Structure formats: structure tokens, C-alpha cells
Design a binder for these strands. Sequence first.
DNA 1: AAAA
DNA 2: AAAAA
DNA 3: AAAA
DNA 4: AAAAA
DNA 5: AAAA
DNA 6: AAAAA
Lengths: 428, 268, 26, 26, 26, 177, 177
Amino acid sequence: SNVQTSAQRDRIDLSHLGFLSGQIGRLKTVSFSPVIAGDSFELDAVGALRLSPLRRGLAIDSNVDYFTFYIPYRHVYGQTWIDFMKDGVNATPLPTVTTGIDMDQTAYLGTVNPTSGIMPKFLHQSYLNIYNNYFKAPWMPDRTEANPSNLNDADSRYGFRCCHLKTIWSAPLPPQTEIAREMTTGSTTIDIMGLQSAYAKLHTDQERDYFMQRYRDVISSFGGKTSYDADNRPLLLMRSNFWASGYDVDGTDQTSLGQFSGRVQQTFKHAVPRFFVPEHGVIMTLALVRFPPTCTEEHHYLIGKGSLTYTDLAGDPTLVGNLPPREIAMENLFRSGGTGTDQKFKVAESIWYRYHPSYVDSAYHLLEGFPFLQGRPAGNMTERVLIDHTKYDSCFQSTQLGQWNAQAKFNVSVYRSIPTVRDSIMTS
Amino acid sequence: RCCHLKTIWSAPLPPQTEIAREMTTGSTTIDIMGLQSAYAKLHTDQERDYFMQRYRDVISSFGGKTSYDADNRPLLLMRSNFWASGYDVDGTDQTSLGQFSGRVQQTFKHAVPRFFVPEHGVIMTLALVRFPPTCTEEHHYLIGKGSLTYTDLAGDPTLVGNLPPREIAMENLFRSGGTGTDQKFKVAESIWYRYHPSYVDSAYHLLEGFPFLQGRPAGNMTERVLIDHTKYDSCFQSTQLGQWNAQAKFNVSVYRSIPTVRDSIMTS
Amino acid sequence: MAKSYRRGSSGKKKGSRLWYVGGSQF
Amino acid sequence: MAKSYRRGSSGKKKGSRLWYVGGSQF
Amino acid sequence: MAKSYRRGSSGKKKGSRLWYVGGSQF
Amino acid sequence: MFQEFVSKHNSPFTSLPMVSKSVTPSVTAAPILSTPRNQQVTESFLDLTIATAAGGIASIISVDPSAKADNQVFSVCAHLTGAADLKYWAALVRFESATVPTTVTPTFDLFPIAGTYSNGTYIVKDCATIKTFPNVAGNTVYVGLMLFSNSWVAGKLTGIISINQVRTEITTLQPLK
Amino acid sequence: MFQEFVSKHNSPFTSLPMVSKSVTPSVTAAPILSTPRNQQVTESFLDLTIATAAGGIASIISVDPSAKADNQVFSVCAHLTGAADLKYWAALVRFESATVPTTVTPTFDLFPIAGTYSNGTYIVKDCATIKTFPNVAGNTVYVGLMLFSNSWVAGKLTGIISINQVRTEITTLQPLK
DNA sequence: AAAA
DNA sequence: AAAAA
DNA sequence: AAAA
DNA sequence: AAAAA
DNA sequence: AAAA
DNA sequence: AAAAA
């Protein structure tokens, strides 16, 4: 009888609750919401973050980060998505990915794993794109797992391991750093105009080692700019940063009179400005919890080197600003550090005059309840930069909620051109 | 037992919902005026399935009204709604240093405006306590369906507002949900673009102290809508006072034409 | 100690009706 | 109960950049 | 912490006398 | 007086029927009396026939892998007795295998347990903390009670044994709450 | 020093008179020494004659159905002894029937109990948590102490047994309150 | 031009 | 946006 | 005159 | 003077 | 006329 | 009248 061809703008409420938990230094999705082209989106999240109960009182605060991204479906499917919308009703169904059989094999995607073992691929593919563009180190290779079932238990359960806060050892110079550059002069002659050309080519190589390892960085150096559709990267909408604090509880019985237990409870807000959605896609929110990288057995570089030369100590501007980067070992910074090839990296020529490390007294070593890196970070450069959550197990009491937990309410309001429920159920 | 708060599964379309309606056209001909009459009769049937299943609803659609004596229904005087909160208590001995226990204590008021009693009868007051229906193993419909077509994902207004209601299974919404006839019901054509469910992380599953529906609501549609109090036993400590208790004072004042006690006991 | 994220399961409803069960239900 | 010596590991940065890893890293 | 519903068993008496035991009784 | 609402080894609410079987103690192939089942179990025996040999026998449960936590508490309560003296002692055992086992692996870890032993009757209500994460990926950890003797005496035994894994806690009626 | 105002198995304030009777242990028809009564009970025996057989005997109470709560605590204290060794062991028992029983049903649940047993003397002051809701509607749950042996020795026994159900609590004088 |  | 507000 |  | 101050 |  | 006041 009466065929409907259009719809008014209606206020849709997409508010819901979230019960979240995770580990230290792993990225995990906490909320998502699919969107349609032409929508007007707004988000506001309010909740409280908690840590597991501590073995002692409060010593060090933790840092919490919240992120929101928008990913069009065209970035995930490509040409398949283009033909999908042009065909219309008789379009081919989109491809899928395979998941595991347990209930928690997709917890990093913020959803319960369906019993069928099959789910759409836009959440898994959007997670990889975010990680490879914003969170991993620029010099390490991309993650290219095809299906969620290809991950190990740790990655699927809690998320991918992220990088420590920047320090001398956790933010070294990239591995493709050269300390020498050779030329092909003659046996008894040299071209000096050719020498000038050699320095010019070395300057462009050093630019791409320190600043420009991505395509959008190269364009930015010329003074241009690239849209997020040019390099197929997710669009960041909002970032929030805050510190979590709490209070202490005193024991009052015979045995525990004089000891204390700390609990962390912090309220937060994450507000995203109004956004106009240009195409069909998804909007995802993620969280990250980290501690400042304090190590017990770390000392000053001048203390660790022992025998000091004029270059080390004088701080002469002519020598500091004209020498190639120096290669140092982990032994020079940590007790029992290594000397082999895997314990070697390169730093600035006089970096020790621009920072001072933190000191932990030997009375605090091997003491439960203090969030510390006991000893030194182990492994090669890749394992040294990435955070390992199992090293923080000595700070918390064992519980089923991991190392941190939160409860938040996401206030989502969208203006959508969709027919009402009454229109959908009445034939005439 | 009463009904859960309205959700996609706890407030489905009524079981007498049709997705097709047949006509008796000719072998090689059709009456098109008869076709117009068929749509008119279908519209009145859909009105009585979605809106008017009681007599007073049918009268209201015409623009009239019925008194509570017409259909012999009770008269509502007042309704009150509030949320109950409390605080936490901390343990301070060796074993329980670091754990907490919550207690709920909320004061309330229920005031009824002055009422003129027209006939002999009774006035009753009742109470109801419910939790929001959060289930641990519940996921998005698009996640549960897996293979997505243009109708599911595009959100095209022409298709959304002109298609019959879709029938879905419990499997598409809950882990280990069923597929048989008793696990099937009907929803709107694009209901998943008008709401978003709550997410419970797997670390909270099978953890005592959180009021949750562990897994999925079981049973047929009748057992799915009605609340079952035995599923909340894992949230409370065992006690003789059930799951909730209250202590209230009812201030009742009435103007009555009754003789005094002195009049009733003195003969003269 | 916690109002918004402990009271209710969603946001305020300012829009079209979503549920139709055949009449009033409480 | 303790703000300055429990929040952060150093002071505020008002000076030249110190770390160069090849791009943005979060 | 609880005044009205813990103090007394009924409301205030503004009306005719109800009890007659033969005299004062305390 | 007040009630002690605090105890070790909360027991399962249902018990297996009494059975009778014959076993032979072994050092490297210690037999298992029943098919292991998830978390708690309690069983009783009418006549357990033990032949003359050296080694041990065990009653085993399968550790629940959910609620990821390496350190968990396991409890035991058993009143084994008989007509003669069989010269045995008992302790907790931990081992893991890739399939459902009918015996105990040659390599295992023992945990001391303090009970009572007058002549041939053993009674204990102890508990201990044991790691639950497997050492080799793809295996399942098994925990139980093992009775060991350097030289068993031929005879028959009867009693009851109960094992529990503390992954959750049980609530009870407290009249003053 | 201070008083311990905390104990297991608060005892009834009145006890039944000492009696003497003869019973025969049974596996499927275990006899009951006395007529079950509501909640707690305590009884003593001057001479309990046991014939040579296999099975058990039990002292049973009837569970109070009021104060609806599935999980409740039951306690026991008994000092049974004799002149010879009868080679027995003990545990708690749970069963239900539609009428007042004189014996124990063939199907029952056992709960481990930790006591002391030197030669033929048994002493225990333990307690446990048992479900109280009946499995089949219209039945009454029964809980008690059962003495079991795979081969009893003919003889006579004497002692005292007390059972309690923790549905309420008892107050006592605390001088510092 | 750099604190890219 | 790690570095008291 | 009562709500004595 | 039992009936929130 | 519907957000009945 | 489930959706901070």
C-alpha cells in the first residue's frame, strides 16, 4: 500500500555499561559502536578505575590512557566494500574470520566470543591498523595475523604488549644507525666536489633514520600534508591522560597492628567532541595502564664506566656536537648487565649530562608490594622496549580480576536517519 | 514472578505476530480492488497485535474513554520509583586486610494525595525490587550473525521501513544459545542500530558478589520474560531475611462518620 | 560514592518508542 | 596524601627534545 | 539515623478517646 | 558460646557410592582409584585390597583451569583404617599429563601433610598451596592424595577420602548476620 | 589470660537418660538407635551390643525446615569407647524419606569427619556444612553420625554422642561486656 | 629552521 | 601529555 | 456535656 | 505524654 | 497522527 | 519513570 522512501532525523540512545579488566601495559578494547554515513556522533564516558589490592601501602601512582578512533569499512575491505554498496540488495556477503572455541578468545576486541566460531573481520582488522600506526615502535615490523585464532592465549586474552615510557634504555636510537660512512677516493687523489655530494646523501639518510620512517612524515618535511585516506590510517578523535590514586587501610588486630594496605580508586571522564561521520564504519575505544620504568639495580653512566676520559667528563661543546653516536652496553647502566651483541645499543654523545636516573636503596630490593623492575630488563632490544606484565606480579595480591579493573558508563547519543519501530512493523 | 526490565530479549514482539498474509487471487486474474480491501483488514489485525489487546485500549483508539468500573479494573492512586545505594566496610585483620563488604541502606517516602472513597472496599500497597538485566555471555547481533548482507549493514531507509519483522534465534545474541522452535522470536527489522548492549569481561564470569545473569536466560518465551530469584543467590550471604528487607511506618489519617467509643458503650 | 556508572544501564530516552508488547506492562 | 613525590618520575620538560625513535610512538 | 519508623508504633492522636479501663493507669 | 564459622576443607555436597576394588602399589606407575573429575570429589570404600609390593596409590582430581591464578589452595580430609597394620604414610602429589591418566607419572612433586597415625588408622584435615599453571604447554595438572610405603603388607583397607580445590567459596547461614 | 568464647558444637542443655540395646549392622538397612527428634540431641549408652556383620549404625536427627536457607552447619561430639577393638570408622550421613524412618535408606551421602582413634576409642569435635533442601518434594532430610566397618567384631560399646543443627545461636555470660 |  | 595542582 |  | 522534631 |  | 542530580 504505502511505500516509505525517507526518514526523519531521530535521537538514538546507545548508552551501555562496561565491566573491564586487564594487565599492565597491554592495549585492550573497551567499547565500540558501528555507525552509518551521515550520522552525528557524540561520546562521554564516566567511571572508576581500580587496581588489585596491594601487599603494602601506596608508593607509586600509575598512568592511564584512553583513546578513541574512527575506521571506515573501506579501509578494512577495500574494493570489496566498493562493490558491496554499488550492487545493493543482491550484493555478496562480506568475508569473515575464524575464532577460537573458548569464551575469552576475543577479549582484546571487547566482545564475548560467539559459539559458532565465526565473526565479521572489521573489528579484528581495525585493531591491527591502530596498533601498527600509533603504538608499536616505528622500526619494528607490523603485526599481520589473518584471524583472531592465530594469536596466542596471552594476546587474545589481554591484548598486545606496548612500549615502556621513554628512558635511555627504553627509547634507544633505531637499530639502523650508522657510526661510519665510506667513500671511494683515489689511490693518491680525491675529488672534493664529490666529497660535498657525499655529505648531502648522508644527511638525507639520517633524516629517514631519526625522523621520517613513515610516508606521512616524508610529506610533512616538504611542508605538505596527507589525509588519513591517503595512507589508510585510522583517525584519532580524542586522547585522555590521568593518574590514579587512593588511600590506605590500617590493621587493628594483634598480628597486623602496625601494617597497612593500599587501594587505588580513581574517577575519570573521557569526553569526545561532536563528530560528523562521512562513511559507514566503526568507532572504537581502548585503554592502557603503565608504570614509570624504575629499576632497582640501575646506576649512573659515569659510575658504570669507571675510567673517565676528557670526552666523557669535560662537556666541551665542540666535541659534544661534532662526534658520531656512541655505542654502549647494558653493563654500563645496570648491575650484571651484558656485554654481547644483543646487549649493545647506541645513544647520544653526552646524553648523561641531560638526565639523571632514580635511586632505589638496597633495603627495598626483593621486597613485595613495591612496583619495581627487579634487577634489569632482560632480552634483546625488542624484548627490552616492550613491557612484560609478569614482572609486576609481586606487587599485587592474587585475584580473578587481573591487575586492574574498571566500571564505566558510556553515554552515546547519535542523530540518525532511521525509521521508527512503528514504521518498521506496520505494513500500511 | 514479574517481568524483567525491557530489553531486546525480555520485550519481544507478541507471539501472535505474522510475517505473511495470503490472498485468494484467481488462476490467471486478480481483483485489485479486492487487494486494497486485504490491506485494510491486515492493518486492523496489526493494531490489535501491537497496541490493543485489552478492551480499554480499543476504546482509546477511537478517542473515547472508559471508567474503571466499565472493565472492572483496580484504580491506581500513586506510584513511586527510586534507586537504593549504600557504602562499604573495610576488613582490618590479618586475613581480610584488603577486602570490602557492601551494605545497602536507603530511606524513602511514598505519599498518596487525598482521596474520596465512593464505596466500601479496600486499599492495598505493594512493593517490587528488580535489577537491570545484564547477562555475562551476551554479544552484538552483527557479531553473532557473522556473514553480513546489504540489508543487515547498510541501514537503507527504504529497506528498513518496508520489510516484515525478522525472526532470530537466541544463538545470535548469547553464547551457547539455542536454535530450536522454543528459542525463536521476532524483532524489528533493524533493531540493532537503535540500541547497544552492555559488555562484561570474562574475568567477571563465575565471580561471587556481582548481581549478574550467569550465561543466558533459559526456558521458552514465558520463562524468559519472568524473573527468577534463584539466579541471584550467588550475590548475597545466606540469611533468614531473604534477599531484601525493610522497616516502614505508614501514616494513615481518615475522616470517618463513626460514633465514638463512649457512644458505643453507654446505653443512654 | 558512584552515581552515573552504578545507577541504570543506559542513557536517558529522548526519541521514538522502541518496545511494543501489546499494552501496558509495568 | 602525597602528590609530588608519588606522581611522575622526574620534573616538567621545558627544553630541547631528548628522544628520537623514528616517529610517533605513544 | 532513623526517627519516624523507629520511634512509636502509630501516628499522633487527634480524635476521640479509644480506651476506658476504669480510671488513670499510667 | 559462639560458633566457629571458619574451617579447612569445605566438603562437596554429594558423595560417590561406596565401591570395592583391588590395586597393586607401584613406584613409577602408581594406580589411580577412580577416574579424575573436575575440582572437588569425595569417595568411600568398603574393601580396598592391596597386594604385597612397593610404591603408592593415589586418588586424583583434575585442576580447574578457569579463573587464571597460579597459586591456589587444596585441602584434604580422610579417615582410612583397617583390621591390620599396613605400614604406610601419606602426602599430597602434583603431576600433569597430556591425556586422562589411569596412573601417576614417574616424576611428581610431594607436599608434606600433617595428620595422625596410631596403628594403621590415618586421619588428617590439612591443606596446602600448590601452583596450578602447567610447566609444559598443552597439559592438565592433577592433584591428589597418595599413600606410600617402602614395603606394603597384604591386606584390605576401608575408609573415606575427600579432596577440594579452593576456586570459589561457600556461604552458610549465620543467624546474627 | 582471656577466655575463648568461641567453640564448635554448642551442646543441648538437657540429655537423654542412659539406655542399653542390641543392634545388627547393615549395608542397605542401617538401623537407627533412637527415634529422630527435631534439631539437637544428645544421648549416652551403658552397653550397646553389636553382632558380627558388615555395615553401619547411625544416630539421626530431623532437620528443622523453618528459616528457609539451603546451606547450614551441623556439628558433632562423641566419645565412644569399649573393652575390645571393633575395627570401625565414622562419618556424617545425609538422607531423606517421606515418613519417620527406623533405618537408613540404601542411598545416602557421606561427609568426611576428622577425629581420633587410638585402639577402639573414638573422639571427635568436628563440624561441616550440609544442604537442607530436599531433593524430592514432600520429604524430610535427616542428618546424623554413622559408624561403619567392613567386618564388625562381636562386642559391646559404651559412650556418648551429641548432634546439633546451627539454626540459631546461644548467648553466654561475658564479664567484660 | 629546528625543540622534525 | 609521565613528571602536584 | 463529653474526647470523663 | 508511645506515636520524628 | 503517531513517539498508540 | 531503569538510565547521576
